[PDB]
Amino acid sequence: MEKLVQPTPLLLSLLKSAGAQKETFTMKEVLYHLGQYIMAKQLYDEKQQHIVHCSNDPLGELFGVQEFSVKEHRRIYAMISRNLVS
C-alpha cells in the first residue's frame, strides 16, 4: 500500500478549500489538490507557464517562496514536506 502523509494545519486548510475531504493523502493526491488550487487562483505566469507566482497569494507563505517552477520537482516535494507531520 502507498504511504499516506498528513498535512499540518495550514496546508490541510488549503487542501480542503480546494475540495479535499480527508486528513491523510498520498503524495499524488496532495499534488493534485495543490495543482487545482494553483489553477483556480490563476497563479501561473501568462507567458512562462511553468512558473507559479506566489508573491500575492498565501501559498507564498505556505511554501516559503515568491515564485517556483513546476519543473523543479525535488523543490516542490521539499516545500510540501515542511508542511507534513513527521
List interacting residues with ligand I18 (CB under 6 A). 31, 34-36, 38-39, 44, 49, 70, 73, 76-77
Q: How many helices (H) and strands (E) does the chain have?
A: 4, 2
Considering the complex, state which of residue 23 and residue 45 has its C-beta at the smaller distance from ligand I18. Answer: 45
Instruction: Name which of 15 and 76 has its Cβ closer to ligand I18.
Output: 76
Q: Are 29 and 35 in contact (CB under 8 A)?
A: no
- In the complex, the smallest distance separating the C-beta of residue 33 from ligand I18, rounded to whole angstroms, is 8
Which residue shows C-alpha cell 507534513? Answer: 84
Nearest CA to 27 out of 83, 72, 66, 71 is that of: 83
CB of residue 70 vs ligand I18: minimum separation in angstroms?
4
